[PDB]
């Protein structure tokens, strides 16, 4: 048609219309803008998450498999909003990367230099925006995550994904095979338990969580985790600030210690978004080599709203440090009381000295 972008000639197109187009003998149109909704925190508007993408795939496959559409091209569309166009376009690209094995340059060629352009994605915090990520960033981050084995659509369970996102069931997401991000539990007397707390305790007990890291002030008694054999560690810093690199080195060493035992780490701040994304984001860059923008895009594709405000520029300015540490640090051979007997990252020179007897 007119304002449509071709993805596959004669069979898949992306359109934008402020009216409902009529299906013809050669074309069938569909939209999900009125049925699959992004739940904004403040002025963030997307991208759509992995559960939204699963729901889109079910709908898209039903249209493709319908015999009535056997000789038609399918046109996926949104309204003309630059934000709603960005969401539709990014979701269709994530579909092709994850379900059809396309590569980044293949899904990005249809979108390049479109006029009017797509709105870049902004953060979920309460200050004016000053940092953006693009569809190219999100596509490269989701592709790299899939290549590294961190996204497994074959096992994805939509029912579980959507259940545990709810506040009354604990407001958490499993991000990777090693990490959970969650909101802080709360109880009436931190110095029986409510439904979201019992839900978290049961899931963690059954899914090999071995360490909980708390980044915000105390709203619950840590004994409830230690009662069932889960280690608890405070690495607390102020809401809305960026952590000193000494806190990041402590966190990465503790996480590596647990991962080498085969366990998972669950990380919360107040909401499990800003502070938590600083620390899990640094470890993902250290381990897998994401760019800062890719890391933010992949995190938000699983758990919307992660990495808030000045934390975005902070991750961007320190990404080289996190990757350098694979060569310039080791896990300490001596415990630090600061991480409850776990081992922080230390310099090569300090590690060499620890293998000798200080005379």
């Amino acid at each position: 048609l007119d304002n449509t972008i071709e993805f596959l000639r004669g069979r898949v197109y992306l359109g934008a219309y402020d009216y409902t187009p009529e299906d013809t003998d050669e074309l069938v149109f569909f939209t999900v803008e009125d049925a699959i909704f992004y739940n904004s925190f403040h002025l963030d508007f997307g991208p759509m998450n992995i559960g939204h993408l699963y729901r889109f795939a079910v709908i898209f496959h039903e249209i493709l498999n319908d015999p009535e559409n056997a000789n038609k091209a399918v046109v996926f569309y949104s309204s003309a909003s630059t934000r709603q166009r960005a969401n539709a376009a990014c979701m269709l690209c994530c579909y092709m990367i994850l379900v059809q094995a396309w590569t980044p340059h293949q899904v990005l060629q249809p979108l390049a230099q479109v006029d009017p352009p797509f709105m870049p994605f902004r953060d979920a915090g309460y200050s004016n925006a000053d940092f953006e990520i693009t569809i190219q960033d999100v596509v490269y981050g989701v592709w790299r995550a899939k290549e590294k084995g961190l996204i497994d659509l074959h096992s994805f369970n939509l029912e579980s994904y959507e259940k545990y996102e709810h506040v009354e069931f604990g407001d958490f997401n499993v991000l990777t095979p090693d990490f959970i991000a969650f909101a802080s539990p709360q109880e009436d007397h931190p110095k029986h338990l409510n439904q979201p707390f019992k839900s978290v305790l049961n899931f963690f007990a059954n899914n090999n969580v071995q360490l909980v890291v708390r980044l915000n002030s105390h709203l619950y008694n840590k004994k409830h985790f230690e009662d069932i054999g889960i280690q608890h560690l405070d690495l607390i810093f102020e809401d809305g600030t960026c952590p000193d690199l000494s806190i990041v080195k402590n966190f990465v060493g503790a996480a590596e210690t647990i991962i080498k035992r085969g366990g998972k780490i669950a990380v919360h701040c107040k909401a499990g978004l800003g502070r938590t994304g600083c620390l899990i984001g640094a470890h993902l860059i250290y381990t897998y080599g994401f760019t800062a923008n890719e890391c933010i895009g992949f995190l938000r594709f699983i758990r919307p709203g992660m990495v808030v405000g000045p934390q975005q520029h902070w991750l961007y300015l320190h990404q080289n440090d996190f990757r350098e540490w694979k060569y310039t640090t080791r896990i300490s051979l001596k415990p630090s009381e600061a991480i409850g007997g776990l081992y922080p990252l230390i310099s090569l020179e300090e590690y060499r000295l620890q293998k000798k007897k200080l005379k």
Partner: peptide, 15 residues
Amino acid sequence: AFTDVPALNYPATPP
């Protein structure tokens, strides 16, 4: 959807 999927792969282009 993610199981038992239509074929929409990117067309092969030459080396």
